[PDB]
Structure formats: C-alpha cells, structure tokens
Design brief:
- Two copies of one chain form a homodimer.
- Chain A contains nine helices and four strands; from the N terminus they run βαβαββααααααα.
- Chain A is an alpha+beta fold.
- The first copy, chain A, has two domains: 91 residues, Glutaredoxin; 131 residues, Glutathione S-transferase Yfyf (Class Pi), Chain A, domain 2, CATH 1.20.1050.
- Chain A has a four-stranded mixed sheet with strand order 2-1-3-4.
- In chain A, strand 1, helix 1 and strand 2 form a beta-alpha-beta unit.
- In chain A, helix 4 packs antiparallel against helix 5 and helix 5 crosses helix 8.
- The longest helix of chain A is centred in the middle third of the chain and has 30 residues.
- Chains A and B meet through helix 3, helix 4 and helix 5 of A and helix 3, helix 4 and helix 5 of B.
- Chain A: Belongs to the GST superfamily.
- Chain A: One of its GO terms (molecular function) is glutathione peroxidase activity.
- Chain A: It catalyses: 2 glutathione + H2O2 = glutathione disulfide + 2 H2O.
Chain lengths: 227, 223
C-alpha cells in the first residue's frame, strides 16, 4: 500500500488517542516535519497486514522514521526517546531532553510513570465506565482512585519544585527546571481525565497550572488541532 | 553507601526481580532491601523521598551521589546506558540507534501493556473485594493477546533465521533488556490461568533459555 517518502516522518494515530497527540506534540516542539494518518478501528483498517507489520502490537501510535529506511517505532514512550535522542545528535542541543545522565534517568522515570502507571489506569477507568458488559461500581472506583493517586504524586512533586525555588506563577517543571518530554507525556491525558470525573483545577492546582503553561505553547496547540 | 547499588524491592514483585536480573547480568554489585508491605515499612518517610510513586522497585546508584531511579524501565535503561559508557561494550543493549528504539519499544510494551494487564487480572482473580468473572476474563484475554504479539514476533525471527531450538531474541538476534523484562512475568502468568508451554511455544522456549542463565537464577534466588 502506502509509500511514505524518505524524508520526515509519518505518524499513525487515531483522532481520539492521547498517546497519539503526545507524539505529535513532541514532533512539533522539536521541529520535525510529519504527516498524520488516522485510522478507523471500527473499519478495522488497523488490522491491515502492512500496518500490522510495522506496529506488532496493533495499537496506535506508530511512527515511521523515513530518514532511517522507514524505521518504525511503535510505542509512544519509545517514540519520544527516539525523537529526543535524534535531535540531541543532529544539533548537539538536548531539547526537551538532557545531556546529563542522572537527569535523563529522571526524565525516563516520569515517562515510564506516565506510560505505565498513569495512561493505563485512566484507560481502565473509562472502560468500566462506558464499555464493560457488566456494571461494577467498585471497578470504576478502583481506577478513578488509582488515577487520582497517581495525579497526587505528580501534584506533590510539582509543589516541592515550586518551594525549592521560592528561595508570581512561573512555570515549574518535573526535571531540570526545564520543559522535557517527562512533562509533555501527561498533557494530552490531563486534558481528558475530566471524562472520568476528575477536575484538575479543583483537585490538582499544581497540575492545572502545569498543564496550562503547556496548553499555552503554540507548538502544543497546532499539534492538538490535529493534522 | 557511595559505591555500588541498593535495590528496594519486595519478595513477590516481578518488576523488582526484573531489575535484580539485569543488575546480576551486567555484573554490578548490589544489595536488596525487601520491604514489609504489611508492617508499613515502605511508608517510612525516608523511602518516600527517593521513590515518589510509592511502588517497588527503587534503585539507588551510590556511585552517583545516591541518585534514585524509581521505575523498573527507567532503572533498566539507566543500568545499560551506564555499562556501555563504562566499558564501551553495549551488553543487553545496542550501539545502534535503530536497534535501541526497538529495544525501547519492547521495554515500554512490557512495562505498560503487559505488566499492568497481568496485575489487574491478578487483582480481580485474587484481591478484588468482589470476585467478578467478566472482569477477570477481560484481563485474562488481554494478557493472552499481548502474549500473542510476543509469540508471533519470536516465530518470525525463527523463520527469518531458518536460511535444535536455538535461542531467538526480540532485537538484534542478541539477548537484550527487551527480552529480560518479560521473564519474571512469564513465570507468574500460570497464576492467572495461562500455561505458556501449551499456549505460547515460542514464548515457552524463550523463557526457558532465559531461566537457564545462572545470573538470572541467582537473582531470582533473592539476593
């Protein structure tokens, strides 16, 4: 099928996939030129054997790095580390990243935290809310509870960085007092937890300001506008 | 202190033994501090500072001013990044960027699509206040699914290699952290009704090749 041209990147996402808009945001914020191909999961066009070849997991997003013989990176977290490590290499400037090893280990910690402790939990809460066969109030509570917990960890880390700086709402970040992919990983998701009953402005003030500083950046906005 | 590593795990935390295995396999000297989750020993104000998520495991890299890496995946990438630098040899990792993005893809798949699903399946089969069948099947099904993705990947590499059952790996026809990440978990799925030997033959030979390695064995012994 589709023959994506050897320059830039092609992103296989879905109109309602936060991890998708997550890669898009980082692409735009890093400058890279990319095109987004959405897919219909009900028309099962994501089971198209050629896509299945590049994304063994069958889940969006997937990014094809044409500049590299159509290399396909198929997990949002690995896509971010890829893009980030490739920018530092091409311009010697670690944007949204860090040159420090102890700094990177921290960026990764927050990235894995979001991808494996935060997104999954939000996903399960939406499931038991609107798509399960049965109706377990306890299943929903379990997850709205874990989502809040995970948000509390973030809220508190944000607070600590604000106080450690108090010695005026300036942006505070998770690592190196600089915007990194650690921070960006959460934004698309922060934007949808209200769907599972979580009000960030009321429940997580720090998180709310943090997301707000991020939602203000144009790179972040166009990406979210969509292709 | 200031030399080596300390690992805060738990006697039955797979992602904990995952870090232990890689430590052992990379040679680094480490001590493991188990935590009694019943006697609230992990709520110890001091631990909470190094491990902001409240979940095991956590690794302190003394050689680096007691730096704390608190996510098994971040821990793994730390260790192999620090070994390639130390010895110019990318053990359980790769020198190639395309290769790494692939190791990272499998690592993130394991940590965020595999481990969390097994955990829910276990929760609903053993720990949920209400033992709801539909809940359990949901996760039992998703675990089998993600295991299918692995099984089929492994198969592909065995055929692209057929010009006994030589070891086949997920990336670079070499054993990486991508492979090891799964091993502690593979060992537990029978607990949620999954027989890898009958259901996932490739996965079964893969885990077998990993379970034979002594480094893997002593680490699981419980250091």
């Amino acid at each position: 099928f589709q023959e994506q041209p050897l320059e830039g990147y092609t992103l296989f996402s879905h109109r309602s996939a936060p991890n998708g808009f997550k890669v898009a945001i980082v692409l735009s914020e890093l400058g890279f030129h990319y095109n987004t191909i959405f897919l219909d999961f009900n028309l099962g066009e994501h089971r198209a054997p050629e896509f299945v070849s590049v994304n063994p997991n069958a889940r969006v997003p997937a990014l094809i790095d044409h500049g590299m013989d159509n290399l396909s990176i198929w997990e949002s977290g690995a896509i971010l580390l890829h893009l980030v490590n490739k920018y530092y290499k091409e311009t010697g400037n670690p944007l949204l990243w860090s040159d420090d090893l102890a700094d990177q280990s921290q960026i990764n910690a927050w990235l894995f935290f979001q991808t494996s402790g935060h997104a999954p939990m939000i996903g399960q809460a939406l499931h038991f809310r609107y798509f399960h066969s049965q109706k377990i109030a306890s299943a929903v509570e379990r997850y709205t509870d874990e989502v809040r917990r995970v948000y509390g960890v973030v809220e508190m880390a944000l607070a600590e960085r604000r106080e450690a700086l108090v010695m005026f709402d300036y942006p505070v970040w998770l690592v190196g007092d600089k915007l990194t992919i650690a921070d960006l990983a959460f934004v698309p998701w922060n934007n949808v937890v209200d769907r599972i009953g979580i009000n960030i402005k009321i429940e997580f003030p720090e998180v709310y300001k943090w997301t707000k500083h991020m939602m203000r950046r144009p790179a972040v906005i166009k990406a979210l506008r969509g292709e």
